[PDB]
Ligand binder design. Sequence first.
Ligand SMILES: CC(C)[C@H](Nc1ncnc2[nH]c(-c3cnn(CC(=O)N(C)C)c3)cc12)c1ccc2c(c1)OCCO2
Length: 168
Amino acid sequence: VNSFSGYLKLTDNVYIKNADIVEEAKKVKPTVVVNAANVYLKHGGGVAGALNKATNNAMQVESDDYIATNGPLKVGGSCVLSGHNLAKHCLHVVGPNVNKGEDIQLLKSAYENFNQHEVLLAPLLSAGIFGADPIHSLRVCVDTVRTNVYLAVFDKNLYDKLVSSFLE
Ligand SMILES: CC(C)[C@H](Nc1ncnc2[nH]c(-c3cnn(CC(=O)N(C)C)c3)cc12)c1ccc2c(c1)OCCO2
């Protein structure tokens, strides 16, 4: 478990790799995989759709029963549920969707959830169709997370831009 390999070390606790988070979860067998969730835990699109399909929809069935009784999460909040075949636990984290006018300042609160876990496999929060500046998201991660975080970014041009920008 937690067999991470091939990552660039950005800081003493933040690592990054150009990889699909689903393929990393299958290789690594992490204690925790982070999902780039939304408040009603509808696992479509982006990371969430890929993670749920890799569980053959088990993640969606569990998430629907959670939401039915507990209601939606808040932006910046999180929820631990089963990791199914991908991890021991899945930490569902809601970053702000700035393309839908949500508050970018809540991105810090979204990464603060990672500090409850010693080591995590995670995506870059609020990137992709959520619209945040990826360079900004990586800075908020580095400044906020104190535990060991292994970021999987599934886009070579974005990965190459993030690393170049970070190394300036
Ligand atoms: C910024 C981008 C690159 C990032 N996406 C990702 N980051 C890391 N691992 C990822 N895997 C996939 C994926 C999708 N489909 N598949 C199956 C596949 O390709 N097969 C051929 C079987 C794998 C996407 C992905 C991101 C991060 C956060 C976000 C966000 C997006 O969407 C909205 C919410 O927040």
